[PDB]
Curated annotation (Swiss-Prot):
The protein's name: ATPase family AAA domain-containing protein 2
Induction: Up-regulated in breast, uterus, colon, ovary, and stomach tumors. Induced in breast cancer cells overexpressing NCOA3 or treated with estrogen. Down-regulated in 5-fluorouracil-resistant derivatives of the colon cancer cell line HCT 116.
Domain of life: Eukaryota
Signal peptide as annotated in the record: none
Phylogenetic classification of the source organism: Eukaryota, Metazoa, Chordata, Craniata, Vertebrata
Record's subcellular location: Nucleus
Domain (Bromo): residue spans on this chain: 3-114
Entry function: May be a transcriptional coactivator of the nuclear receptor ESR1 required to induce the expression of a subset of estradiol target genes, such as CCND1, MYC and E2F1. May play a role in the recruitment or occupancy of CREBBP at some ESR1 target gene promoters. May be required for histone hyperacetylation. Involved in the estrogen-induced cell proliferation and cell cycle progression of breast cancer cells.
Tissue and organ distribution: Highly expressed in estrogen receptor positive breast tumors and in osteosarcoma tumors.
């Protein structure tokens, strides 16, 4: 129905605003664009499902997220990919892990404060009806 289309459109506006706030944070610049295979040829071989915030915006605009849970699965991937690719004790790897955990924690904290639980439940119910 048009009302369900309206619901998904509101979800996309909400997710674009959360993603823009993460992308303009200086700590998260490394996560804003895909890893360049030139610098990092082993990346695409270790990480089977690369994810970054520009990919997330593209997904929003392709109507790939129909619930905030689906979006948070991709934010979790940005985090877990960085934990897996950069697991060493050296400071460059620790800095990327800390920035990835902080992204993820920031996204969840904005959603806890600003997503109405009944809106998420509505999205879940429309998704499940498809
Ligand atoms: C799970 C998300 C966060 N990751 C982190 O804790 C990172 C890196 C780290 C990870 C394990 C260590 O034993 C020591 C450092 N930042 C810190 C705590 O400086
Ligand atoms: Cl830096």
């Amino acid at each position: 129905s048009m009302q369900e289309e309206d619901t998904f459109r509101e979800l996309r506006i909400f997710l674009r605003n959360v993603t823009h706030r993460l992308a303009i944070d200086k700590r998260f610049r490394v996560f804003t664009k895909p890893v360049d295979p030139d610098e990092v040829p082993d990346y695409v071989t270790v990480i089977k499902q690369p994810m970054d915030l520009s990919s997330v915006i593209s997904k929003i605009d392709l109507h790939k997220y129909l619930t905030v849970k689906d979006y948070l699965r991709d934010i979790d991937l940005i985090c877990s990919n960085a934990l897996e690719y950069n697991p060493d004790r050296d400071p460059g790897d620790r800095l990327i892990r800390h920035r990835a955990c902080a992204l993820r924690d920031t996204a969840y904290a904005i959603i806890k404060e600003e997503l109405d639980e009944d809106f998420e439940q509505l999205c879940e119910e429309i998704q499940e009806s498809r």
